From Swiss-Prot, chain A:
Result after altering K174R: Partial loss of polyubiquitination
Name this protein carries in UniProt: Apoptosis regulator BAX
BP term (GO), one: kidney development
Annotated GO MF terms: BH3 domain binding; channel activity; Hsp70 protein binding; identical protein binding; lipid binding; protein heterodimerization activity; protein homodimerization activity
Amino acid sequence: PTSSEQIMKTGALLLQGFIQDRAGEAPELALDPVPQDASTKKLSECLKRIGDELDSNMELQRMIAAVDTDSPREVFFRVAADMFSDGNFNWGRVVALFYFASKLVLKALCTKVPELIRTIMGWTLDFLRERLLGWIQDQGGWDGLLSYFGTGTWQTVTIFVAGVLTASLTIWKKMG
Amino acid sequence: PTSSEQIMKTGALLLQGFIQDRAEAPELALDPVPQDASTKKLSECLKRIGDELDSNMELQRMIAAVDTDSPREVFFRVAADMFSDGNFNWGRVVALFYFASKLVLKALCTKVPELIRTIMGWTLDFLRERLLGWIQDQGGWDGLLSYFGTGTWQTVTIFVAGVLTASLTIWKKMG
């Protein structure tokens, strides 16, 4: 079903996957790959493609560079809060949030702080549970995410998804 | 600067703004690209021309002829034809965005909201493949403002309406 547990599980899987897919290590600390069904695999392939396009948006990469490299806690929550501050929701924003969390993880890996992988995922899944889960339930599950994106629209949806993340980062940056 | 990325961003913002102002699945919404002072001036320019074009009855009759729920081939044929002489001017760009916006509005009317993203996709693909080199040689979108004075809204409208109506007539008559 469209139960809480399953939306949480799929969330954790997608995020972990994205951090695998963007990542192209403390072995005893690894979180094993959530196993993926047909449905989740299609979501994962969706996210990989939109992530690769976001990686090519230079304005967004300048903004992610500005993120407090080894102290990202306050920046994750302020960016997350701001992007959802109008009380509306869309799948582009959910994708933006997972992407950003994934880049924060990658920035920590570089800084060789691997216990942040767990911590950042924890912040993101807590945010999903507290703030997004109701909406994803009303939508009938994670499957809806696929229809936010279409086969001929990747370059175009990217602009708007990059745009929302870059905007919340700009406010975090300028407001200090 | 006026890199491909910024031309594409401003185009998406301008188009989204052209559409959003006139007029629905919320989970599918593309958030509004945020606007600086200069994009704001462009957007106000576009709203004004748009309002005038909406008053051109000949143009409204041709837009009504547009295949309501199957707009793909009409969009590309109209867009191709309008730029077929290999020249460019800002009137044509505006005509292309206006037309794409009316197509979106006609799709919303028929309750087909996934068309919002698809038509934007076609319009921005065309901007990227066909117009972007020219806008860069022009120094960016700011030049669009010089195509429109302040004392000439009824006058520039006739010619901008004329170009879009002409390409629609060719589409309609060639079948």
